[PDB]
Amino acid sequence: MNLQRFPRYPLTFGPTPIQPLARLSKHLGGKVHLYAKREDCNSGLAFGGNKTRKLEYLIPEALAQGCDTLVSIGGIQSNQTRQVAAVAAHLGMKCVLVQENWVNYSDAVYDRVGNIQMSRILGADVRLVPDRSWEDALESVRAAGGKPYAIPAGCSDHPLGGLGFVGFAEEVRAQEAELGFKFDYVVVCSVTGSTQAGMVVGFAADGRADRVIGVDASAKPAQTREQITRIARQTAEKVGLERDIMRADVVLDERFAGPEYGLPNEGTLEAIRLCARTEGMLTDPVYEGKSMHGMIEMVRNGEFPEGSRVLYAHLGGVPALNGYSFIFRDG
Amino acid sequence: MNLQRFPRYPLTFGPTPIQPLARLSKHLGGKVHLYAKREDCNSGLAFGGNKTRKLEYLIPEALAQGCDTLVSIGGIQSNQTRQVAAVAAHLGMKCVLVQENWVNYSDAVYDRVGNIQMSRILGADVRLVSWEDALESVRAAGGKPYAIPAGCSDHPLGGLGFVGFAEEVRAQEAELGFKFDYVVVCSVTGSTQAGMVVGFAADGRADRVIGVDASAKPAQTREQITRIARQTAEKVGLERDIMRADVVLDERFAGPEYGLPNEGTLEAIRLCARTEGMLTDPVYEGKSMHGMIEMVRNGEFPEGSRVLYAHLGGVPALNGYSFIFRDG
Amino acid sequence: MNLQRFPRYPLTFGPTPIQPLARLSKHLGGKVHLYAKREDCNSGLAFGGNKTRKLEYLIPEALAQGCDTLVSIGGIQSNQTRQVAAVAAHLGMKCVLVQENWVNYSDAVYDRVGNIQMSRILGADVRLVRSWEDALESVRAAGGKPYAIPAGCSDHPLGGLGFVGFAEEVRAQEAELGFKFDYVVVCSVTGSTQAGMVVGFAADGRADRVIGVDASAKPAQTREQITRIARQTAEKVGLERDIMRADVVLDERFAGPEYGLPNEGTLEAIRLCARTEGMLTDPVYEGKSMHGMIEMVRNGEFPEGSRVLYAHLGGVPALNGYSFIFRDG
Amino acid sequence: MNLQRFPRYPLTFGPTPIQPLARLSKHLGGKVHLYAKREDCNSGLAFGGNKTRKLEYLIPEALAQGCDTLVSIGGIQSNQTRQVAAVAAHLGMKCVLVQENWVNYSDAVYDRVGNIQMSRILGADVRLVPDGFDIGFRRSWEDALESVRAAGGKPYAIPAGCSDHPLGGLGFVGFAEEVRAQEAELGFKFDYVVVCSVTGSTQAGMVVGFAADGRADRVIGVDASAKPAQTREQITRIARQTAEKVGLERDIMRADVVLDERFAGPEYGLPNEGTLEAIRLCARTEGMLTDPVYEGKSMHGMIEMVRNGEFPEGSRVLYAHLGGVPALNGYSFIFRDG
Numbered sequence A: 001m002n003l004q005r006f007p008r009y010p011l012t013f014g015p016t017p018i019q020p021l022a023r024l025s026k027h028l029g030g031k032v033h034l035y036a037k038r039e040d041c042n043s044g045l046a047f048g049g050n051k052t053r054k055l056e057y058l059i060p061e062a063l064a065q066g067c068d069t070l071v072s073i074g075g076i077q078s079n080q081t082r083q084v085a086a087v088a089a090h091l092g093m094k095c096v097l098v099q100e101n102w103v104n105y106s107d108a109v110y111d112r113v114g115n116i117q118m119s120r121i122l123g124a125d126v127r128l129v130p131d132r133s134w135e136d137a138l139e140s141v142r143a144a145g146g147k148p149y150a151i152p153a154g155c156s157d158h159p160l161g162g163l164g165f166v167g168f169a170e171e172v173r174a175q176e177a178e179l180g181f182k183f184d185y186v187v188v189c190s191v192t193g194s195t196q197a198g199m200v201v202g203f204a205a206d207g208r209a210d211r212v213i214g215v216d217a218s219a220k221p222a223q224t225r226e227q228i229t230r231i232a233r234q235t236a237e238k239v240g241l242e243r244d245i246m247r248a249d250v251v252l253d254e255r256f257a258g259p260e261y262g263l264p265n266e267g268t269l270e271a272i273r274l275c276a277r278t279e280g281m282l283t284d285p286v287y288e289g290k291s292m293h294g295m296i297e298m299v300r301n302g303e304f305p306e307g308s309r310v311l312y313a314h315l316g317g318v319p320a321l322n323g324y325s326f327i328f329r330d331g
Numbered sequence B: 001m002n003l004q005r006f007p008r009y010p011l012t013f014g015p016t017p018i019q020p021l022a023r024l025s026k027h028l029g030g031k032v033h034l035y036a037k038r039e040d041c042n043s044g045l046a047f048g049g050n051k052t053r054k055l056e057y058l059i060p061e062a063l064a065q066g067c068d069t070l071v072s073i074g075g076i077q078s079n080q081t082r083q084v085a086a087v088a089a090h091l092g093m094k095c096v097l098v099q100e101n102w103v104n105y106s107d108a109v110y111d112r113v114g115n116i117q118m119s120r121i122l123g124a125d126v127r128l129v130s131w132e133d134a135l136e137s138v139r140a141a142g143g144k145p146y147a148i149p150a151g152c153s154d155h156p157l158g159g160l161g162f163v164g165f166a167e168e169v170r171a172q173e174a175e176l177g178f179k180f181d182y183v184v185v186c187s188v189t190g191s192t193q194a195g196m197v198v199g200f201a202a203d204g205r206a207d208r209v210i211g212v213d214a215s216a217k218p219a220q221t222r223e224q225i226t227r228i229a230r231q232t233a234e235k236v237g238l239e240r241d242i243m244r245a246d247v248v249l250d251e252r253f254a255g256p257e258y259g260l261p262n263e264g265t266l267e268a269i270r271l272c273a274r275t276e277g278m279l280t281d282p283v284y285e286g287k288s289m290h291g292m293i294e295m296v297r298n299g300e301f302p303e304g305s306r307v308l309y310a311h312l313g314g315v316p317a318l319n320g321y322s323f324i325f326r327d328g
Numbered sequence C: 001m002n003l004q005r006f007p008r009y010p011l012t013f014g015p016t017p018i019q020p021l022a023r024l025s026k027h028l029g030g031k032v033h034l035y036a037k038r039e040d041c042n043s044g045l046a047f048g049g050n051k052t053r054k055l056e057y058l059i060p061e062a063l064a065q066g067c068d069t070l071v072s073i074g075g076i077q078s079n080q081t082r083q084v085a086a087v088a089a090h091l092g093m094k095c096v097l098v099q100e101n102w103v104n105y106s107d108a109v110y111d112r113v114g115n116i117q118m119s120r121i122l123g124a125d126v127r128l129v130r131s132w133e134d135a136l137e138s139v140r141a142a143g144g145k146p147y148a149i150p151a152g153c154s155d156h157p158l159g160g161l162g163f164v165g166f167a168e169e170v171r172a173q174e175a176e177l178g179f180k181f182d183y184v185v186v187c188s189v190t191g192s193t194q195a196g197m198v199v200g201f202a203a204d205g206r207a208d209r210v211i212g213v214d215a216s217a218k219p220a221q222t223r224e225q226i227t228r229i230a231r232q233t234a235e236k237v238g239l240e241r242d243i244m245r246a247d248v249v250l251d252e253r254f255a256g257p258e259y260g261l262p263n264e265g266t267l268e269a270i271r272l273c274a275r276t277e278g279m280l281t282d283p284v285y286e287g288k289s290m291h292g293m294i295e296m297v298r299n300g301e302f303p304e305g306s307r308v309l310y311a312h313l314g315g316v317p318a319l320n321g322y323s324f325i326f327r328d329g
Numbered sequence D: 001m002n003l004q005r006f007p008r009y010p011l012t013f014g015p016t017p018i019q020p021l022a023r024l025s026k027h028l029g030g031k032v033h034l035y036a037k038r039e040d041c042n043s044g045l046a047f048g049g050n051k052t053r054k055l056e057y058l059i060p061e062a063l064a065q066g067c068d069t070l071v072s073i074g075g076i077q078s079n080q081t082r083q084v085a086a087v088a089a090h091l092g093m094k095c096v097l098v099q100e101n102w103v104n105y106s107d108a109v110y111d112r113v114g115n116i117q118m119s120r121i122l123g124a125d126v127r128l129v130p131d132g133f134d135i136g137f138r139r140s141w142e143d144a145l146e147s148v149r150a151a152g153g154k155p156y157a158i159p160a161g162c163s164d165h166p167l168g169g170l171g172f173v174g175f176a177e178e179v180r181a182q183e184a185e186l187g188f189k190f191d192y193v194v195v196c197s198v199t200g201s202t203q204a205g206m207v208v209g210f211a212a213d214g215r216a217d218r219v220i221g222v223d224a225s226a227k228p229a230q231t232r233e234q235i236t237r238i239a240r241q242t243a244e245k246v247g248l249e250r251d252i253m254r255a256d257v258v259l260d261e262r263f264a265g266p267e268y269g270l271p272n273e274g275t276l277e278a279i280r281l282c283a284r285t286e287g288m289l290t291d292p293v294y295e296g297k298s299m300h301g302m303i304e305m306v307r308n309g310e311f312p313e314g315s316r317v318l319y320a321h322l323g324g325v326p327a328l329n330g331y332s333f334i335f336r337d338g
């Protein structure tokens, strides 16, 4: 296949480093070698993260089409909108964000710290629903004579949204080369879908598509899984996957998404603390903390073949921790 | 001089990238080329930052010394203490932090968001109020503590990190094929600008390191940078003396107090964030961003100068000043 | 029966006033006449409320025993502990409070505003968590004599006298008004507030007219505590009847979803009551009982022409720990 | 003097009680007897307070004019706007509140707790502008008033603190009168009154009410504005206009208006270390709470005056607790450990 056919606008530092999680792994019995690829450290634009990798392939079309405003949407503590706001500012574009109440969480500063605080500082017009927002948004832009580039939730349901992470697999291969070995697995957090989509496609190439263990954080596994499966197939087409994406290539564990999207369970919190305390690597209570929780449990349940080398994709999400201050008041 | 003599423990991804601040540069007139060396993006340990570069030179001694607990100190929203906590966990060491009330700011979640929040999740013993007090606590507790002063600054190895930064800059200016005429850096505890002074004294550009005070006590800050630069110049074998002309510290933007932004600070933070997508904070970086922007605007920089802004980190503290930014 | 047998230490301004809720009644159809008894405005000690009426009958004993420290317990935004902290202060006594997290809520300032904020200012030693026993032991051990006040003052020999007095007060005021109330709406969680009332009104045959509104979300249990406390209390004031389960009325339709958490109906009732009468209620206690009464009048559960007396127990300060919910109203 | 000439709509339970501050009086040496008249406990309408006493003489006019909306104004933790909001809801009137941060303070939950939170729950249209918007400059006051008209309603304008209004000082003339009535019930007299002062019609009403019996200079005002000159002038002006309004047949002299300035620091709405100790001291002896903006400053004053022997030995000092407690919620960090 050839991803190179599509331009890629530089929004990151370059390939993302892979680090070993020796302590955590040892702490879990050293039967599985845990690593982490730091998408959460990929950019100077308000901490970047997975979405910013996706955005590298969307911005050319946006620029190509002469759009002057980037418009997107997500929950109050959405990492996506924050990155869009930063990318927009860096690209000299306006930005309109529609933030809705996607989480049944009521915290005094939920709408004033973390991701959303940055978006406002970055100059985005941050529109908070009551309590069609999307179309009003696009229109107000047109109305103001601007031209909006619509970026759907997480950049996922878009023709280009699966690309970024195809190249992710492509990166892991280059690093594996210098590494003298290939990872047996890839643990990734899944919600809107195009991150795991790209990976499924990217690793399908060398037949590891089913080695990408997605961990659902949506709490709506069915939809999420179907969106990954769907987004993959389409992306595979878009790149030239000399193979087809089977409903067996899309893996999605559903044991760690509870209780609801945006709410952590006690395993989520323990996982965040375990990992932060052994590696000095933080994960959040909405996304990464759930995928981390997933891996620690998989490992702990011997679900991973001794000697296995698992690559944990850390997608970002850390700033959202500020929206859950009470839970971590004593750590 | 010879920095290589001293061991360095990898806590960073490696050399920090330099980026053009084209939009901001153009916005201010096009007469001065501004760039940013991202020390704030140097590590996977809870955002890292400048303090993390410093730490790489102190850790070896902690390890050598067989120490098992890193002890440090700073205000409630201290970046230093958060980095020590992350480094600590990464090394598998204990961590005791003395968070003092160094800022006359009253915010309902000041001691529960941002930096301090991370230090607790990172498993550090976070004590709120003492230095010696905690240290002894550790010994009396049966553990060997490695003492890390505020900002890692007043310490024998505290200046090495940024001596290394000037070296990195050199190595990058070579690749870039051009040299920066100045460096704008925020200064509070001192060993950051101290290391740069010694580093750039090496090639005759000490006085091009333009520090901006964020302490609101320029006198002490300037003297600390000088003292640190001399002790550090001696350790690296600098074949020269640090003169007062080598320590440039602008006092115009620290106001009104440490930990407290002025309207210029916020204006600066909004401008830079909105032109480059690059965030700075109300305590440190915003104040240095503010000075650099104001310098350009005053024409204090020679038309054509290339200014390397050093972004030391600190963004997480923004969570403690949420009401100020509630509408942007 | 005889209530005067027990000494009452004054901690209130005197009987609590009764106000008509003319606007709310009309808003709901004017078929039922709603009134309110401001237990929430009963004291100058940190806003007071129902717990303070209870405490008047417990303090003489703490003093008699020469106790020097009041010890109590409750959730983070407990009203009980805040009132106890204010009484100790007033009395000149120490105060140790065991604050437990009884609510699945995690707001950023939950342990720093509202009731708990007041307790710390009032000089109480606020310990965030055997919990209860350790506290007591610790006082003795420190050289003090602690008076034990169980949650809500409820499971305590004297916990029920305060509201036996409430019914006493009500008949007197009913006289003054030349008429009587047909029903009393009241919020129940630990039990002695409703139990006291059940006893005082049994005395005139209106026990079963004290409509309890569960806010525990564990109705069976709460209902059992009201029943028990009530029987132990009716005995202590020499009620001429043994208290029957049929004397205790506890509606459990408005308690959801959990203790300390409001439902969309709770929010609606707080808003409507606030916007028609200028009287605030909280998302943990009163708003639930308010929701209850409004719902009853609405479903036409009170006979046409009834006079309902809503007992406003207090609680308003807890509103501060639920600031996100009310950000826009 | 004939205050009875002006109608008074009930918004209170009746005369506010007076209580002895025996514990605090004892702690300071026993040489001075402190009491508190509880205006802070005067109403069932969202905790009420002094502003509510003032409102009783304004509402009759609002009603006679057929107004359907009460429009007022104040800072973020304003006590006045919260009382207006409750009074409005109670009367079946709409309410528009014009608000802005009038304090150089910026706590994370400042605009979502305490007073302003209640106003919103009470159904007021709380129009809070962003920093630097400057309402008093753009005259947002008037726009709100006009927008009510534009919307076809009829607004009743209530100025900051009810003070600079023709009827704004009547309520506290009633306070002097009521005090006289209680001094007769009690069988004894109060030698001074301590009252926090900012917009001024509270103390102005007192000055007029007490001048009628030669006790005006007995009302010791304690500035919490940190702008004593203006505040003194507004009190004096309000006093004179009200004096005339109630037929007081005497002039209010410069000597009748007493405003201490020593306890206002460092700025309106910002407490000083003495403010905080006073709050803690009073609360820990009497179980009576006071706030960082208003009452805590006047409480600080009284305590300090007593401590400095500024009160003749044996005086009975009546502390007027004007309210304000809900505002403690906006200063949570300061009290995080008590």
Ligand SMILES: *[C]C(*)(*)(=[N+][C](*)C1=C([O])C([C])=N[C]=C1[C]OP([O])([O])=O)C(*)(*)(*)(*)(=O*)[O-]*
Pocket (backbone or CB within 6 Å): A049, A050, A051, A073, A074, A075, A077, A078, A079, A080, A081, A153, A154, A156, A189, A190, A191, A192, A193, A194, A195, A196, A287, A288, A315, A316, A317, A318
């Ligand atoms: C959807 C979304 N966030 C995407 C995301 C993250 O920001 C982090 C830190 N982890 C995982 C995800 C899930 O990625 P996908 O592509 O499946 O949505 C947002 O902010 O709206």
Ligand SMILES: *Cc1c(COP(=O)(O)O)cnc(C)c1O
Pocket (backbone or CB within 6 Å): B049, B050, B051, B079, B080, B151, B153, B186, B187, B188, B189, B190, B191, B192, B193, B284, B285, B312, B313, B314, B315
């Ligand atoms: C500590 C710090 C500074 C000041 O550095 P010093 O070495 O103490 O002079 C500036 N910016 C940030 C983000 C810091 O953490």
Ligand SMILES: *Cc1c(COP(=O)(O)O)cnc(C)c1O
Pocket (backbone or CB within 6 Å): C049, C050, C051, C079, C080, C152, C154, C187, C188, C189, C190, C191, C192, C193, C194, C285, C286, C313, C314, C315, C316
């Ligand atoms: C404690 C409390 C209740 C419940 O009273 P119980 O006697 O425990 O049943 C109701 N409302 C408020 C405001 C309370 O503080």
Ligand SMILES: *[C@H](*)c1c(COP(=O)(O)O)cnc(C)c1O
Pocket (backbone or CB within 6 Å): D049, D050, D051, D079, D080, D161, D163, D196, D197, D198, D199, D200, D201, D202, D203, D294, D295, D322, D323, D324, D325
């Ligand atoms: C408004 C107010 C004051 C000052 O009264 P003025 O009439 O404005 O001088 C004092 N205390 C409290 C609690 C207030 O709300």
